[PDB]
C-alpha cells in the first residue's frame, strides 16, 4: 500500500493495462502498476496512433525514479514531477500526463476503504469521489449506442411509458404466440439481463400491456417477479395493478391468474400467484411476486439491511424451483430502481461463490448491464447505495 490514490491499480498486467487505457481512457491517461517482471518495482502506463507506453520505476530504499535523475521520497511526488516535466518516448511521442485513470476494481473485503476514500472530495474539488465515478459511466454511455428500432415503431408507441426509454433490439424480449389482429404483437418494453442467472428488466405495466406482460412471464417460464414500486407515487401512476385481489380470479387475455395467498412484511409483500392459460389443462405455474413498497422514487431505501434480507428471499425462492426462468424485475421505467437491485444481486452472487476475498468492480458491472438495457442505475444516490449494500453484506458475513 504505497499510496491511497486510485491511479494506483496494484496488481495489473501490462497486457491488461493496454486494454483499460485504450477503452476507458483518452489521450494522456496514465496509471501506475506493480511490476510483473521485477517485484518491488512499479510501472507507469501512459496512453498517447493510439499507443500505450510502459515506463518502469525503481524502488531503492523507498526512493523512486525512472532509471535516472532525481530520486523522490514518495511515488505521488514522482507522478507530479513528470506531469510538469514530461518525458519523451523513443518513438518521439511526448508523454503528456493530463488526467489519471482512477481505478474501479476493489477487493470485496476491502470495500470500506474504497467507500471511505470515494467520500473525500475529488480534484477543483467540487464533488466527492462517488460523483466522479458516476460521471465516468455517464460519459462512457456514448460508446454504447445500439439500435432500438423496434421500440420506436409507430405500432409500439402506446406500449412505452416514456418515449426515450426503449429496449435494445439485440437483447429485447420477443413474444411469439400473440394476436394476429395486432399490427405488432411481439413487442414488450423489456430486456434479458445476463452477467446460471438471467434477469428480465421491464417497465411498469401500462393498461394496454398487462396482457402482454403475463404473456412474457408464461413464455419465459419465470416463477419470481420483483416489483420495486408502488402503484402510485405522489399523484402519478407508476405501474397499473397487473395482479388480482387476494382470493380473486382475473383474466388477462389468453392468460389466467389467481392470487392464492399474500404475506405482509414491513418493507414488502409476497403474493403467491397461479398462472395458467385459458383452455389448456395442467399448464398452471406458481408465480411469486415480491412487492417492495417502501422504496422512494428517485431516492434510496432507508437501510441496506432490509433490502438484503428481501434480496436473499428472492434468491432462495428461485433456487427452490427447478429450472425456473429469468427473474422478472420492474419498477416504473425499469431503469433506475430495477438496475440498482439487479446490479446488487449480480455482485452478491459473485460473493456467494468466491467469498469475501474476490475482485468486485461496480462500474464494470453497471456498464456490462447497461449494454443490455439503456442506462441502468439512474441517479448517483442509487450508485452509492450499491456500495453501501455490498459493504453491509460483507460486514454480516464477517460476523460469526
Q: 325 among the known binding-site residues?
A: no
The residue among 78, 103, 128 that closes a domain is 103
The residue among 57, 83, 103 that closes a domain is 103
* 251/244 Cα distance (integer angstroms): 9
In contact, 73 and 56? CB cutoff 8 Å: no
Is 172 found in the same domain as 59?
Answer: no
Nearest to 216 by CA among 377, 127, 326: 326
Q: 333 among the known binding-site residues?
A: yes
The residue among 83, 103, 123 that closes a domain is 103
Q: 336 among the known binding-site residues?
A: yes
Is 73 found in the same domain as 109?
Answer: no
Range of the domain at 73: 1-103
Q: Resolution in angstroms, to 1 decimal, for this deposition? A: 2.9
User: Which residues share a beta bridge with 224?
Assistant: 288
CB-based burial of residue 320 (10 Å sphere; 0-12 exposed, 13-18 middle, 19+ buried)?
A: exposed
Rounded to 5 degrees, φ, ψ at 162 are -120, 135
Is 40 found in the same domain as 188?
Answer: no
Is 164 found in the same domain as 96?
Answer: no
Query: Burial letters for 47-70: b for 16+ Cβ neighbours within 10 Å, e otherwise?
Result: bbeeebbebebbbeeeebeeeeee
Q: 352 among the known binding-site residues?
A: no
Residue with cell 460473493: 351
Domain count of the chain? 2
Is 118 found in the same domain as 87?
Answer: no
Neighbouring residues of 371: CB distance < 8 A, sequence distance ≥ 6 = 144, 146
- Residue 122, helix vs strand vs coil: strand
Is 288 found in the same domain as 373?
Answer: yes
Strands (E), the chain: 30-34, 42-47, 52-59, 64-66, 68-72, 105-107, 121-122, 127-128, 172-174, 187-193, 199-202, 224-227, 232-233, 236-237, 249-252, 255-264, 268-277, 285-292, 327-330, 359-361
Is 190 found in the same domain as 170?
Answer: yes
Take residue 377 and report the three cell numbers written for it. Answer: 442505475
Q: Is 331 a catalytic residue?
A: yes
- Residue 19, helix vs strand vs coil: helix
CATH number of the domain residue 326 falls in: 3.90.190.10
In contact, 362 and 260? CB cutoff 8 Å: no
In contact, 372 and 335? CB cutoff 8 Å: no
Is 79 found in the same domain as 175?
Answer: no
Rounded to 5 degrees, φ, ψ at 61 are 55, 45
Is 241 found in the same domain as 369?
Answer: yes
Experimental method: X-ray
Amino acid at each position: 500500500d504505497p499510496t491511497s490514490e486510485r491511479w494506483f491499480h496494484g496488481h495489473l498486467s501490462g497486457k491488461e493495462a493496454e486494454k483499460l487505457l485504450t477503452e476507458k481512457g483518452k489521450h494522456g491517461s496514465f496509471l501506475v502498476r506493480e511490476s510483473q517482471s521485477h517485484p518491488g518495482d512499479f510501472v507507469l502506463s501512459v496512453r498517447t496512433k493510439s499507443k500505450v507506453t510502459h515506463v518502469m520505476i525503481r524502488c531503492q530504499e523507498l526512493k523512486y525514479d525512472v532509471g535516472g535523475g532525481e530520486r523522490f521520497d514518495s511515488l505521488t511526488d514522482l507522478v507530479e514531477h513528470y506531469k510538469k516535466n514530461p518525458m519523451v518516448e523513443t518513438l518521439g511521442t511526448v508523454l503528456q500526463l493530463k488526467q489519471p485513470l482512477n481505478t474501479t476494481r476493489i477487493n470485496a473485503a476491502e470495500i470500506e476503504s474504497r467507500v471511505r476514500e470515494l467520500s473525500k472530495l475529488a480534484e477543483d474539488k467540487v464533488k466527492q469521489g462517488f460523483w466522479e465515478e458516476f460521471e465516468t459511466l455517464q460519459q462512457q454511455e456514448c460508446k454504447l449506442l445500439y439500435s432500438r428500432k423496434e421500440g420506436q415503431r409507430q405500432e409500439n408507441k402506446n406500449k412505452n411509458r416514456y418515449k426515450n426509454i426503449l429496449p435494445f433490439d439485440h437483447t429485447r424480449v420477443v413474444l411469439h404466440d400473440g394476436d394476429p389482429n395486432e399490427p405488432v404483437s411481439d413487442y414488450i418494453n423489456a430486456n434479458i439481463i445476463m452477467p446460471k442467472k438471467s434477469y428480465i428488466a421491464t417497465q411498469g405495466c401500462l393498461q394496454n400491456t398487462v396482457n402482454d406482460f403475463w404473456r412474457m412471464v408464461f413464455q419465459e417460464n419465470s416463477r419470481v417477479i420483483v416489483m420495486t414500486t408502488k402503484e402510485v407515487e405522489r399523484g402519478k401512476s407508476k405501474c397499473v395493478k397487473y395482479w388480482p385481489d387476494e382470493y380473486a380470479l382475473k383474466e388477462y387475455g389468453v392468460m389466467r391468474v389467481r392470487n392464492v395467498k399474500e404475506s405482509a412484511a414491513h418493507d414488502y409483500t409476497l403474493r403467491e400467484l397461479k398462472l395458467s392459460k385459458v383452455g389448456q389443462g395442467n399448464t398452471e405455474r406458481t408465480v411469486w411476486q415480491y412487492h417492495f413498497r417502501t422504496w422512494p422514487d428517485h431516492g434510496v431505501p432507508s437501510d441496506p439491511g432490509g433490502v438484503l434480507d428481501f434480496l436473499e428471499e428472492v434468491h432462495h425462492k428461485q433456487e427452490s424451483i427447478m429450472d425456473a426462468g429469468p427473474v422478472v424485475v420492474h419498477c416504473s421505467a425499469g431503469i433506475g430502481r430495477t438496475g440498482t437491485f439487479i446490479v446488487i444481486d449480480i455482485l452478491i452472487d459473485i460473493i456467494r461463490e468466491k467469498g469475501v476475498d474476490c475482485d468486485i468492480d461496480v462500474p464494470k458491472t453497471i456498464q456490462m448491464v447497461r449494454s443490455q438495457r439503456s442506462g441502468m442505475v439512474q441517479t448517483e444516490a442509487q450508485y452509492r447505495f450499491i456500495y453501501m449494500a455490498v459493504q453491509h453484506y460483507i460486514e454480516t458475513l464477517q460476523r460469526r
